[PDB]
Amino acid sequence: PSEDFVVTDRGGIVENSHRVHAAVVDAKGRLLYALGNPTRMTLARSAAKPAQALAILETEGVAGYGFDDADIALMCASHSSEDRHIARTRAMLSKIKAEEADLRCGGHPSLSEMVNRSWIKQDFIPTAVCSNCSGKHVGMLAGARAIGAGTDGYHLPDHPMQGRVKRTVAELCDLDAGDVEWGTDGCNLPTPAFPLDRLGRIYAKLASAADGSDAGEGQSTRCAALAHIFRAMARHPEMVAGEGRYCTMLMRAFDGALVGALGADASYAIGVRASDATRQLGTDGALGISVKIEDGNLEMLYAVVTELLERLGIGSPDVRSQLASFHHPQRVNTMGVTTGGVSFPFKLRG
Amino acid sequence: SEDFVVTDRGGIVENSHRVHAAVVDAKGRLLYALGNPTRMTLARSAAKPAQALAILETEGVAGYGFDDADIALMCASHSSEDRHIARTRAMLSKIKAEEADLRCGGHPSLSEMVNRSWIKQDFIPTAVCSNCSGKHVGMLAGARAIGAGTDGYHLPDHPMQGRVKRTVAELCDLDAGDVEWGTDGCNLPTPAFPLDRLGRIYAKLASAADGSDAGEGQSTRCAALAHIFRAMARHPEMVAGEGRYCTMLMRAFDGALVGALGADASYAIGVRASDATRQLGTDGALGISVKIEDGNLEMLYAVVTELLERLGIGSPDVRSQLASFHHPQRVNTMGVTTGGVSFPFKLRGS
Ligand SMILES: [Cl-]
Ligand SMILES: [Zn+2]
Ligand SMILES: [Zn+2]
């Protein structure tokens, strides 16, 4: 497993190499395939957002605000700060009678180079509603208001909204509280770390809940909420990230068969609804995939995730070809000459 | 040897980066190491002083009257500031060439501050803006000086590139077959060789400067190497630019060493003999070369600065000018410190 790498070359000469870790799990979290160390203790960063959205949606009273599926997809989002994302953030603040000054996240350069270039041309200074995490933050303000906890300090560990987040994360992971560690995210919220396979487990449970809903099975309130989060992400993938973004292009290509989301510093998680491909992989239910590039390189992350989907047989060559520019990153110099490429000397193990 | 620089979020491991380093004496003998000090490595722009030597040794180039700042630009990966473009143009005029003779292409500036001003003006960079433009003018100079014609000066079959290839292997003390060649972002042949030989090149620069200063008899080659060292140290803003690590490093040391970046996170430093180098157990100059395996530049500058502190090169006051690179900021969008950088590696002798 110490040999699982993605490697870039220049004229066949090794340039950089990147250690890969991955877990492929069933709906109960049993490990089916791995790369690297599948239990690596890993900060999930923004890939935890579906679990935080579950804590929001399980907060009594939040249903009264009338958030719709696109709002819930924005809670699940690391969005590009496109004008539609900012506008929806402001519209969600109005639903809870809050204002931009109540947010405790900060502005940052857009995750999209094209958006950021427009901002630079305009001397635009991003503010709190422009945060890629702005939907999650409005959701947590919503829950704070709904239980009467006060919006001041909704982002601090001592607040009941964060106590709810912390218990919800551990429960979805099937871990004791002491086995989840906490830091602080760029958006200024508590953010969890846990073994990488458990990030796969969370997304397997998302997809499993979607399968149960679609088949008409009786569900707990939790499974119904998980099915709702899956549906929202898959129905509004442009809210989850934006134009040209991997997460958006991936979920559009698969048209409801899976959901996926990025974690900052190069983690990724995918929940796959039961299919011919999942059955061929040896399980009778939904499937979860999680990935971490040890050194944090995002370009390599998206190449590896796409390569892994091909090796697992998920989708078809035609579906996955929508991701070709991520799968095989361009290596072209300033005069248009191809100078190298990207290779995948790793081996899936069962 | 498992040597890493490790970033954390709240003490939880975020990313880790494998480090390779060689510390060599003036004859290339290995004194200290991290990782694999003989890793086959693409030197990229850190090879520029060897390419400048090939230029300066070309018959007739002396008649063009290149000065020290011109030679510093030949050795540069500059930020494309207005002064770098103006010097490139002055060098083209010295050889009666024009911008359309260049065979490098434009690219987003290596400086974020420069790139933002370009984006604001809708400026599209051209050949004269290349971070390698000084090297390219020098190659055009050599091609013209021997009557080989400017057309195709960048191609492997051109006599200028034959001179570069030979000069690189000679400075490395390697046979031609032990240097591999690809194509750079700037569309020139670019060499790969064991990482320690990159340190050997820079040790030879600093040794030549020591010998020029001590008034030793010198070959034409050692005299030119001494000139290259002097030029980089006298004009470190030409080698890179405002705010750049290479510039701030050489300014802080005020002639005691030179250093330059290789794209995809290699670094090389040539250290003139000093109380520090004697304390490390050599009676001459010293060379340092570093590669971050995954290509991360931020981690490269942190590691190089930590290495200078471990090796005792400079004073605490001198190295404090590099504090922002040594321990990069880890502060979120709300001004809260969220993490840090650590150096759990240990330098081994021999
Ligand atoms: Cl390139
Ligand atoms: Zn966040
Ligand atoms: Zn170049």
Numbering used by the authors:
A (entry chain A): 3 to 352
B (entry chain B): 4 to 353
Authors' description from the paper:
The ReAV enzyme from Rhizobium etli, a representative of Class 3 L-asparaginases, is sequentially and structurally different from other known L-asparaginases. Asparaginases (EC 3.5.1.1) catalyze the hydrolysis of L-asparagine, generating L-aspartate and ammonia. ReAV is a homodimeric protein, with each subunit containing a highly specific zinc-binding site created by two cysteines, a lysine, and a water molecule. Two Ser-Lys tandems (Ser48-Lys51, Ser80-Lys263) are located in the close proximity of the metal binding site, with Ser48 hypothesized to be the catalytic nucleophile.
The absence of Lys263 led to only subtle structural rearrangements and atomic shifts within the active site, largely consistent in the four protein chains. A water molecule fills the available space left by the lysine side chain, marking the site of its Nζ atom and maintaining the original pattern of hydrogen bonds. The Lys263 mutation affected the conformational state and hydration pattern of Ser48.
